[PDB]
């Protein structure tokens, strides 16, 4: 909303400041052109620095949702939303997101009316076995990029108001400020759910004078 905040000058906060001065201070008619021109730089910064990495990143390589397979997407959703240390989904609404996605994978790749292999999302509490089980029934989805109707569904699931915002940027568009700055405070108390567990990604509120 443009209200000033005192945060520790971590790498993620210094990226937040850079974007406040060169991307988010622009009028809406010049925002999308600047995001399309800076794309490659922006994604490199998000992946190195910020606490919400660029979602479409398959083993260091900066892709887009359009150029990711359905396996790639599923295994990225588990990598970002499921905490290996506690061996549980950081939020239940994230497990729902990942289940909804794995069911869409079945819908897209099945030839006839069948039973979902994910009967209850409670089965995703072993996510690597749930994924293998889905992408063994439908091995075509290991080698196909996302159908553009499934990109639009995935981004529509990312904007659901009745779930914890997704811990990543899925797209550079008109809504990039909302993706980048929404739900920015919990991370500092739960570094187990941050990318490298690196504090330097996160936003920690603190006073300049009381820091003495």
């Amino acid at each position: 909303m443009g209200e000033p905040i005192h945060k520790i000058a971590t790498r993620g906060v210094m990226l937040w400041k850079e974007f406040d001065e060169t991307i988010f201070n622009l009028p809406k008619n010049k925002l999308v052109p600047t995001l399309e021109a800076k794309r490659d730089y922006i994604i490199s910064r998000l992946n190195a620095d910020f606490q919400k990495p660029w979602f479409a990143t398959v083993n260091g390589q900066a892709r887009d949702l359009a150029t990711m397979t359905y396996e790639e997407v599923a295994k990225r959703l588990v990598e970002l939303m499921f905490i290996r240390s506690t061996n549980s989904w950081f939020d239940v609404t994230w497990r729902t997101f990942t289940g909804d996605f794995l069911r869409r994978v079945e819908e897209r790749f099945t030839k006839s009316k069948t039973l979902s292999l994910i009967q209850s999302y409670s089965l995703l509490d072993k996510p690597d076995e749930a994924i293998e089980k889905v992408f063994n029934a439908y091995p075509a989805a290991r080698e196909q990029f996302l159908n553009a109707q499934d990109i639009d569904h995935f981004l529509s699931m990312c904007q659901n108001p009745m779930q914890k915002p997704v811990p990543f940027v899925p797209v550079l568009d008109r809504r990039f400020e909302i993706f980048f700055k929404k739900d920015s405070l919990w991370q500092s108390e739960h570094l187990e759910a941050v990318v490298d567990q690196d504090v330097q990604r996160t936003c920690i509120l603190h006073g300049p004078v009381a820091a003495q």
Binding site: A37, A66, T67, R103, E106, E107, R108, F109, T110, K111, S112, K113, T114, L115, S116, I118, Q119, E143, Q144, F145, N147, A148, Q149, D152, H153, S156, Q159
Partner: protein
């Protein structure tokens, strides 16, 4: 007798009746017993005195049969209704006692299929599997710059695209993907993404009511409307500028007998009436307004409209709802061009997609702009524009000023260049009537072998309009629809090639396009390869005074000299040819050694500062002349061994190139118009080709008459046939002629032709022949060989590099296709050429200029540093 019209209602009690030791018969059993009465013994018995055959199974001995029937049916209904009521009550008792939480862990989730439309790129086998089918000697023997491959194809016709048409042709019903693709084409469904009645929806919606449509619900909701409005059907006036063949407008010239009541018309229009009529009209100024009073006098010519009933009411029209907008063409292009041009632009972008080329300018990474040809043509061109300028202009209607340029046959190919390709390649537009598309392939081949191009768009297109429809009826070429109705035939069954009763062709409309290129370039680019164009030939017939009469010219392609055939020629034997190539490869090596030695001797006399330049230039020249000599030998012993040999038919040698015999030409895609002269003459031509080339008795070619489904689209006919041939090659499925009720008894004399009525799923087709017989003696033939014959001519590494590049490009192609389908932007007109007007001359005049990715705009363009560069 169980399961008949009269006794199906009693089936449930039939098991009960059998418990009285009564026998109830199956229809088969009861027929068997009845056919026992027609045996000669019972017939001989019937001729003496009447015969009474009790085939009752003891039913007459059931006392009070209705009482027993009524009992058994009541007991069965009672048991049913009891068990249904007790089951419902026990399930409501178990639900109240344990609650609604008990049947929530027991309930399961149901997954409904979404339509996942595939581009059906050819399946690439492992290098071990493809190396078995080709002879071992083929590796290195072919020059791949001189092997033509089809890398992409598409059509717009009565059944939609090549994907939908193939489904209907081969299977006779649509899958989920087929239905959704037809529903999208015909504008029954659009894609919605965003808020829909508050709730956010991402999927298909009905296009009129904007109500959501699940992909499962598409077939139920639209199949009947999609079938009713596709393929051969009654001419729809909405599609043809209000043209109704029942009420066909002409004008009678009458002489005026009594002076018509004056009418008010402008001063210009009144002077134009006075110039025409002379003293038979009186124009007078009205001082009040300045308009003129035009009075026609006794004896003035006048024209009164009358309507004629025409007897051709059926045609293969593009599915109702088809709209170039749906594919992404803008309204400024649609207004400007003739609708045949729109079928072409869609077919061209759809063929680039099937090639996995989303951006045509990609081609300019690999070839010079002067190396991309457009060898495609039409039979009659833009007949909507002709009707504009001959008839609508005469009636002082509003017609655009450039309508002439839209009529030209060569104008569709121009709009493809001006909107998509922006090449400076060859542009040879054939006009072959019904053979155009095969004449297109032959020109596109000769262009790529002569080295003037490395890629041709080829194919054909034609439209259906009132005037053509009429003049094809006046020649009696087309089927009379009133006669077909008198004979019981529905529209669907009016196109029936090779049938006793065939009586003229069904007119259709549409376009078909193939992208052909050199194999050496297709392997480099990693485009899919659907087939090899082994041979393509045209032929006139002979002296005669009937332009529409088909003839036997194309028989020349099997011309072979059988005076001296005692001992097999070495030249046909691939080992011999490979041995002579290896012998010549050793000499080319010794020629490169001897030219490098001679360059070392010459470089000494050049000073030691200029030496680097001179050795670079002269080394490159040597490398060129070494490749030139290797490729010329490969051509001489691999590709062109049979051009000078009168003992090897052009048709035999095309197959022999890839180690196929004449017996390995499994399918013949016949022109098969459903005319009396065409279908006999075609069978007889194929039969005489195969007989002369010694095709093994008992191995007929399997005729394929695609025009039973599509109707004859004239220009486009062979383009469609080719697209079908490629779909047979890559699938192994040979579609049958579902209108071949009864094959014409005359065609039994041709032992080497089989005419199936149903789809055969073979174990593979190695080659397909396509024949066409246009008006004006245009015969034509093309052979197409399964692409897996090519992969035996390359090494494992080059194959595996290819397989990886095609996999990557098939994935990018699927991406581009689905994004374009849902956002109505498959077709994306180019704004600018790949060069600015300042570089135009510089790019044309450098044959090594290539496009590269411009870092700012992200779009392939020529950069001034890559033009007459050293690198």
């Amino acid at each position: 007798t169980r399961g008949t019209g009269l006794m199906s209602a009693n089936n449930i009690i039939a098991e009960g009746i059998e418990k009285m030791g009564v026998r109830t018969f199956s229809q088969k059993e009861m027929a068997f017993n009845l056919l026992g009465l027609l045996t000669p013994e019972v017939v001989e018995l019937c001729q003496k005195s009447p015969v009474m055959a009790d085939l009752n199974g003891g039913l007459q001995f059931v006392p009070e049969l209705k009482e027993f029937t009524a009992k058994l049916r009541k007991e069965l209904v009672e048991t049913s209704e009891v068990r249904k009521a007790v089951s419902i009550e026990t399930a409501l008792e178990h639900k109240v006692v344990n609650g609604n939480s008990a049947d929530a862990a027991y309930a399961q989730v149901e997954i409904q299929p979404r339509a996942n439309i595939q581009l059906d790129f050819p399946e690439l086998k492992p290098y071990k599997q493809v190396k078995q089918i080709a002879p071992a000697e083929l590796e290195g023997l072919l020059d791949l710059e001189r092997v033509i491959v089809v890398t992409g194809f598409a059509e717009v016709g009565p059944w939609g695209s090549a994907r939908t048409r193939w489904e209907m042709e081969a299977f006779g019903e649509f899958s989920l993907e087929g239905c959704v693709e037809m529903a999208w084409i015909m504008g029954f469904i659009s894609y919605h993404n965003g808020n829909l009645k508050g709730r956010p929806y991402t999927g298909w919606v009905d296009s009129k009511t904007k109500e959501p449509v699940d992909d499962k619900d598409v077939k139920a909701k639209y199949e009947t409307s999609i079938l009713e409005h596709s393929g051969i059907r009654l001419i729809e006036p909405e599609l043809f500028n209000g043209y109704n063949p029942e009420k066909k407008e002409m004008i009678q010239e009458v002489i005026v007998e009594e002076d018509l009541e004056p009418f008010e018309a402008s001063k210009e229009t009144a002077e134009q009436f006075k110039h025409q009529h002379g003293d038979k009209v009186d124009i007078f100024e009205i001082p009040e307004t300045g308009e003129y009073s035009v009075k026609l006098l006794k004896g003035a010519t006048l024209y009164i409209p009358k309507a004629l009933r025409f007897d051709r009411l059926v045609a293969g029209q593009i599915p109702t709802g088809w709209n170039a907008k749906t594919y992404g063409i803008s309204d400024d292009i649609i207004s400007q061009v003739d609708p045949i041009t729109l079928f072409v632009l869609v077919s061209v972008v759809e063929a680039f997609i099937a090639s996995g080329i989303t951006d045509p300018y990609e081609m300019y990474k690999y070839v010079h702009v002067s190396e991309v040809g457009n060898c495609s043509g039409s039979g009659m061109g833009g007949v909507s524009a002709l009707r504009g300028m001959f008839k609508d202009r005469f009636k002082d209607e509003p017609v655009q000023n450039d309508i002439l340029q839209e009529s030209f046959i060569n104008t569709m190919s121009a709009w493809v260049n001006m909107l998509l390709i922006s090449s400076s390649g060859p542009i040879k537009t054939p006009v072959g009537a019904c053979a155009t598309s095969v004449e297109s392939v032959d020109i596109g081949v000769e262009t790529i072998l002569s080295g003037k191009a490395r890629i041709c768009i080829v194919g054909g297109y034609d439209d259906f309009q009132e005037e053509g429809s009429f003049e094809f009826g006046n020649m009696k070429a087309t089927s009379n629809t009133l006669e077909e109705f008198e004979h019981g035939r529905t529209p669907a069954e009016m196109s029936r090639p090779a049938t006793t009763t065939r009586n003229g062709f069904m007119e259709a409309q549409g376009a078909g396009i193939q992208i052909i290129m050199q194999a050496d370039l297709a392997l480099k680019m990693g485009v899919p390869i659907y087939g090899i164009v082994a041979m393509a030939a045209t032929a006139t017939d002979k002296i005669g005074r009937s332009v529409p009469a088909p003839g036997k010219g194309i028989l020349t392609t099997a011309r072979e000299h059988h005076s001296s055939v005692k001992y097999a020629s070495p030249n046909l034997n691939m080992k011999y040819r490979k041995r002579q190539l290896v012998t010549r490869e050793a000499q080319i090596k010794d020629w490169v050694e001897n030219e490098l030695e001679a360059l070392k001797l010459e470089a000494e006399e050049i000073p030691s500062e200029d030496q680097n330049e001179f050795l670079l230039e002269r080394t490159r020249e040597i490398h060129n002349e070494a490749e030139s000599q290797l490729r010329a030998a490969q051509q001489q012993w691999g590709n062109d061994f049979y051009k000078r040999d009168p003992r090897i038919a052009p048709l035999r040698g095309a197959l022999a190139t890839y180690g196929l015999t004449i017996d390995d030409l499994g399918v013949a895609s016949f022109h098969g118009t459903s005319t009396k002269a065409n279908d006999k003459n075609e069978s007889a031509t194929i039969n005489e080709m195969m007989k002369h080339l010694g095709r093994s008795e008992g191995n007929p070619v399997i005729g394929v008459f695609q025009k039973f489904l599509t109707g004859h689209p004239k220009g486009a006919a062979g383009a469609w046939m080719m697209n079908g041939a490629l779909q047979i090659l890559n699938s192994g499925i040979i579609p049958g002629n579902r209108n071949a009720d009864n094959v014409d008894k005359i065609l039994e004399q041709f032992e080497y032709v089989l005419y199936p009525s149903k789809t055969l799923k073979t174990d593979g087709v190695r080659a397909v022949s396509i024949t066409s017989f246009g008006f004006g003696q245009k015969g034509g033939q093309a052979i197409v060989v399964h692409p897996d014959y090519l992969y035996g001519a390359i090494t494992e590494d080059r194959y595996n590099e290819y397989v990886a590049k095609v996999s990557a490009r098939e994935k990018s192609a699927y991406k581009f296709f689905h994004n374009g389908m849902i956002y109505n932007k498959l077709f994306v007109s180019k704004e600018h050429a790949p060069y600015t007007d300042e570089l135009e001359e510089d790019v044309y005049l450098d044959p090594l200029a290539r496009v590269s990715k411009d870092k700012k705009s992200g779009s392939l363009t020529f950069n001034s540093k890559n033009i007459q560069s050293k690198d």
